């Protein structure tokens, strides 16, 4: 069969972008980072995103900034829900107060834990419209490293549909 690592193309509904943006913008108005998840069905080397999940989450101030934490009960709920629905977790998305990048905390505590998963970072509290060329995207390798996906490669990979 085909591992998630071998996905090369992703269909992303515009509605799923809108749900992410609305959540990130909403919590950003309070100075907080938010998190969202893209789930769907893998079709071998293609992945169809079906839904955005906004996990139950808490917002905590750290020494050098802010973070978003997903509690254990919610991670269990999400696991059971994916299993009952026949869905796969492809991507996590979170916002930064300013420039987008993967921090050391982001590298260590991801929710999208499977080799091949994506982690997208939206700058400036998602104030501007979502743009695949303006996010900072990372993909998890077999040695558990989150490596940057250059913008040109990200736009070749992900097509937004309506």
């Amino acid at each position: 069969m085909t591992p998630l690592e071998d996905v090369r193309t992703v269909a992303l509904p515009r509605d799923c972008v809108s749900t992410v943006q609305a959540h990130l913008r909403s919590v950003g108005q309070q100075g907080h980072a938010g998190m969202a998840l893209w789930v769907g069905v893998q079709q071998d080397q293609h992945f169809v995103i079906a839904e955005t999940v906004i996990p139950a989450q808490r917002h905590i101030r750290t020494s050098d900034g802010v973070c978003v934490m997903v509690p254990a009960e919610e991670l269990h709920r999400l696991n059971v829900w994916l299993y009952k629905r026949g869905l796969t977790l492809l991507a996590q998305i979170h916002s930064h107060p300013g420039r987008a990048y993967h921090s050391t905390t982001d590298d260590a505590y991801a929710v999208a834990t499977t080799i091949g998963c994506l982690s997208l970072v939206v700058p400036n509290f998602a104030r501007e419209p979502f743009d695949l060329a303006r996010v900072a995207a990372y993909r998890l390798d077999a040695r558990a490293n989150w490596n940057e996906v250059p913008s040109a490669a990200l736009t070749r990979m992900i097509t937004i549909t309506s």
């Binding site: 978003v68 997903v70 269990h76 999400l78 796969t88 979170h94 505590y109 991801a110």
Partner: protein, 82 residues
């Protein structure tokens, strides 16, 4: 006397064969490797049964009183971004 455990990780099942004297953490390591879940190490995950109870990962598999067709959910202790 091997026990068959379906472990579900991010909604994906993997069947792990277990012997009664093995601690549950032995199955944790195997299920994560089988499902390619590497972004947090094995000690960062915990088991819950179908009724939702948290299971002691150091307890021997034979001491739970599983039936042969048991499904367990293996999920992260914490997720953080920022």
């Amino acid at each position: 006397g091997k026990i068959e455990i379906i472990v579900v990780v991010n909604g994906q099942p993997t069947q792990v064969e277990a012997n009664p004297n093995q601690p549950l953490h032995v199955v944790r390591t195997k299920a994560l490797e089988n499902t390619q879940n590497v972004a947090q190490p094995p000690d960062n995950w915990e088991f819950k049964d179908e009724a939702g109870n948290l299971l002691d990962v150091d307890k021997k598999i034979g001491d739970f009183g599983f039936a042969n067709t048991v499904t367990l959910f293996l999920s992260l202790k914490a997720g953080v971004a920022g």
